[PDB]
Amino acid sequence: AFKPPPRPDFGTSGRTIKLQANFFEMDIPKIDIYHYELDIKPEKCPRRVNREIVEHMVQHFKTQIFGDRKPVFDGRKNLYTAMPLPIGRDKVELEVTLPIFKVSIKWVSCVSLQALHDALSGRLPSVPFETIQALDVVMRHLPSMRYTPVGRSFFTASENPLGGGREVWFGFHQSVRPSLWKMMLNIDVSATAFYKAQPVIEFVCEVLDFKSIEEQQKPLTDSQRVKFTKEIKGLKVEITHCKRKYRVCNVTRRPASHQTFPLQQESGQTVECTVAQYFKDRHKLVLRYPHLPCLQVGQEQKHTYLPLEVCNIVAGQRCIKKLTDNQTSTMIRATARSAPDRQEEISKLMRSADFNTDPYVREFGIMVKDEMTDVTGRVLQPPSILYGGRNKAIATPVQGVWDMRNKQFHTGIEIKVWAIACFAPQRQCTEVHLKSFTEQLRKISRDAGMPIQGQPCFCKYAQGADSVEPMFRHLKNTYAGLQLVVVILPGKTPVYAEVKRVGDTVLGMATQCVQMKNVQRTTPQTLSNLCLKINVKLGGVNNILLPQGRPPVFQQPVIFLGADVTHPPKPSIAAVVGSMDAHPNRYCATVRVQQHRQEIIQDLAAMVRELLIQFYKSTRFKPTRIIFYRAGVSEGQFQQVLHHELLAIREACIKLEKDYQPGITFIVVQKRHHTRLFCTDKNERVGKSGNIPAGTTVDTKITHPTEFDFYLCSHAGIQGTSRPSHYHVLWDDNRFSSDELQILTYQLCHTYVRCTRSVSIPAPAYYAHLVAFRARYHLVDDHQALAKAVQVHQDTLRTMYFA
RNA sequence: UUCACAGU
RNA sequence: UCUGUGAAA
């Protein structure tokens, strides 16, 4: 429970496919970096001014200390140098005057790049983290000051108007990653909304829709002024009549020709003076547009007013405000390019890159290749999908997609008793709408092998979440064992949360919500997917993996776990699900409420205990193996999460029986990264987005130099560029081969019951996500109060309500 | 709240 | 959480 296993071997399954990865080979020396800690006071100033302070500190004491060395800075306390500094362990104290700060700097440690080279080779088993971090600081130093940092991406002005004084800025993500033999620089592109570096007058011309400012010869109306105010308030501006930056707190009601302030004269006496007057006398600036209001800057009652024609919107402030759908449309154009388009963008960026010409990068003897890394991937064979009925039809996924035509559920549920609760206006969702929807739904359901062989025994209109529980209870007594309540919803509303709370937690009634728009106008696809959900919620089995096509791990009892934690931007929600049959199709769910933004699953031992117990209840077997798919953890959390959670799983096992120790395979699933894969050959591109084919597997060249990880793109890219899921094996008692684990994961991506498609992550993980989200919906109304708020009814525990 | 994918 | 695309020829 300490060190992740080494890669057992390399996969050879599937067919080869030529790929390009947005990893760029790095040339890294074997010298020793010197790591110093900086303690600068005052310590609460922003990062970029820290970088300015450090920079001036460096170029000031050149004769004395730093000399020819160009140190890099992470923006906080960490400094790195290629050559040693005239330093000891003792903190040396300096003072730097910025156009005054104390700067304490001491020697921390030597960072060996030789040991890193060893880690890339077969010399060392582990990759030293502070080497990677140091390298990252080296590569990020200059672009942190030259560009505008958003998150860990660097953004800049294009060469892209958005309207409303807003524009698209283009940026790139950059990160140093360890790979086999060589270090890699992962680069991706992105775009976001910024405010233009234009004069405030141009800004009002764009916000108030003026071609020329001469359009408004008269003062602004209250409406105009209010819109402009709510658009510019909070934004920083800079003056052009001296320089100084100000933050706008309000816009004056009065125009500059009438807005007054208490002018403090040389005598010490105050006299009320208009802004226009002051700018005419003091700055000899006759305002060309005195009929416009002023920007109130500074704070509160300091009466600092700036006329519009002397202010510019400062560059580098991203627009977080929601945008117009036109602006959002062009935004979509920019941010979600097709795979070849993104490929070409990255390629262009790196063919015109600044890394090799960066003085700080060259100081540490680093070089970066211009071309993407050529990688050979493997497209895995998709599993066949077995259905039921008399035909027992078998579907073959083509490009990660199949359908239900001429196919019936492996185990369809006969729906005898069901009701309809319409929370939409009757005059808007009429009776004939409900009737037509009903007969069409019955047609589709009968075709799918889930026969709704009768009209609803109940069908009423309603309004108010407060009406949900009294009705549902009424439905629970009036009608002997209904199976389903279909609830029609008029868009986003609290009654959905209430319906799920009442149905799942307090009564144990299966409920299926349908939005109003999908009742008025229905499509066979929508009805079919709806039937997938309904059949699953009633205990049915939509389909199974072809038994003979399963990997040999299924020759012995095995449980598949999925785990996820969702956090508030207010407790965190942990969810763990587990397989309950050998197909594997049906899953049981457990969920806990826990500490605010705690990523470690606190009550994992108990949850796993419950799941194992339920597994034995369902299969009459104890699992010989436990496959644990953990979602949403970063590498920085790997050791902690692995430690506590693997100990928790083993704890559950040993607290169930004395000598019961099944093999545990701990696998982290991550969809949030910047790895992009492209088809080298144009004829391998799939669809209009031109993405790699579903089942594309990569476990070479860009993966970890020693540990057991791989990329799997199991889904078909519909729009933009696909995001291949990454899998990192933190533990493996079962000694999986790469092929078997990759194939297993891929097949598990075909067991997701809400669609006849291969999804991006294995069904366990996805289900865990769904469970956590549902729990979030259960908490809409004390720690243990919240705990029993997410605890489902007894008649729900053995169900797949989260579907 | 038919669903998946993709952006933030 | 929102936003977008997709389930013509």
Curated annotation (Swiss-Prot):
Residues bearing PTM Phosphoserine: 354
Entry annotated with the keyword DNA-binding: no
One Pfam assignment: ArgoMid
Gene name per UniProt: AGO2
Family: Belongs to the argonaute family. Ago subfamily.
Consequence of substituting residue 596 to P/A: Abrogates RNA cleavage. Binds siRNA
SUPFAM superfamilies named in the record: PAZ domain (SSF101690), Ribonuclease H-like (SSF53098)
Residues that hold a divalent metal cation according to the record: 564, 631, 769
Region (Interaction with guide RNA) location: 278-283, 491-533, 671-672, 715-723, 752-774
Effect of residue 595 to R: Abrogates RNA cleavage. Binds siRNA
Top-level lineage group: Eukaryota
Any one cellular-component term (Gene Ontology): dendrite
Organism name: Homo sapiens (Human)
SMART domains: DUF1785 (SM01163), PAZ (SM00949), Piwi (SM00950)
Residue stretches in coiled coil: none
This protein's domain notes: The Piwi domain may perform RNA cleavage by a mechanism similar to that of RNase H. However, while RNase H utilizes a triad of Asp-Asp-Glu (DDE) for metal ion coordination, this protein appears to utilize a triad of Asp-Asp-His (DDH).
Cellular localisation: Cytoplasm, P-body; Nucleus
Domain PAZ: 199-315
Outcome, altering residue 500 to A: Impairs RNA cleavage
Described function: Required for RNA-mediated gene silencing (RNAi) by the RNA-induced silencing complex (RISC). The 'minimal RISC' appears to include AGO2 bound to a short guide RNA such as a microRNA (miRNA) or short interfering RNA (siRNA). These guide RNAs direct RISC to complementary mRNAs that are targets for RISC-mediated gene silencing. The precise mechanism of gene silencing depends on the degree of complementarity between the miRNA or siRNA and its target. Binding of RISC to a perfectly complementary mRNA generally results in silencing due to endonucleolytic cleavage of the mRNA specifically by AGO2. (Microbial infection) Upon Sars-CoV-2 infection, associates with viral miRNA-like small RNA, CoV2-miR-O7a, and may repress mRNAs, such as BATF2, to evade the IFN response.
Substrates-to-products reaction catalysed: Endonucleolytic cleavage to 5'-phosphomonoester
Name of the protein described by the UniProt record: Protein argonaute-2
4-hydroxyproline PTM sites in chain numbering: 662
Post-translational modification: Hydroxylated. 4-hydroxylation appears to enhance protein stability but is not required for miRNA-binding or endonuclease activity.
Keywords: Cytoplasm, Disease variant, Endonuclease, Host-virus interaction, Hydrolase, Hydroxylation, Intellectual disability, Magnesium, Manganese, Metal-binding, Nitration, Nuclease, Nucleus, Phosphoprotein, Repressor, Ribonucleoprotein, RNA-binding, RNA-mediated gene silencing, Transcription, Transcription regulation, Translation regulation, Ubl conjugation
Keyword presence, Ribonucleoprotein: yes
Subunit comment: Interacts with DICER1 through its Piwi domain and with TARBP2 during assembly of the RNA-induced silencing complex (RISC). Together, DICER1, AGO2 and TARBP2 constitute the trimeric RISC loading complex (RLC), or micro-RNA (miRNA) loading complex (miRLC). Within the RLC/miRLC, DICER1 and TARBP2 are required to process precursor miRNAs (pre-miRNAs) to mature miRNAs and then load them onto AGO2. AGO2 bound to the mature miRNA constitutes the minimal RISC and may subsequently dissociate from DICER1 and TARBP2. Note however that the term RISC has also been used to describe the trimeric RLC/miRLC. (Microbial infection) Interacts with Epstein-Barr virus (EBV) tegument protein BGLF2; this interaction participates in the regulation of cellular miRNA by the virus, leading to enhanced SUMOylation.
Annotated consequence of substituting residue 645 to G: No effect on RNA cleavage
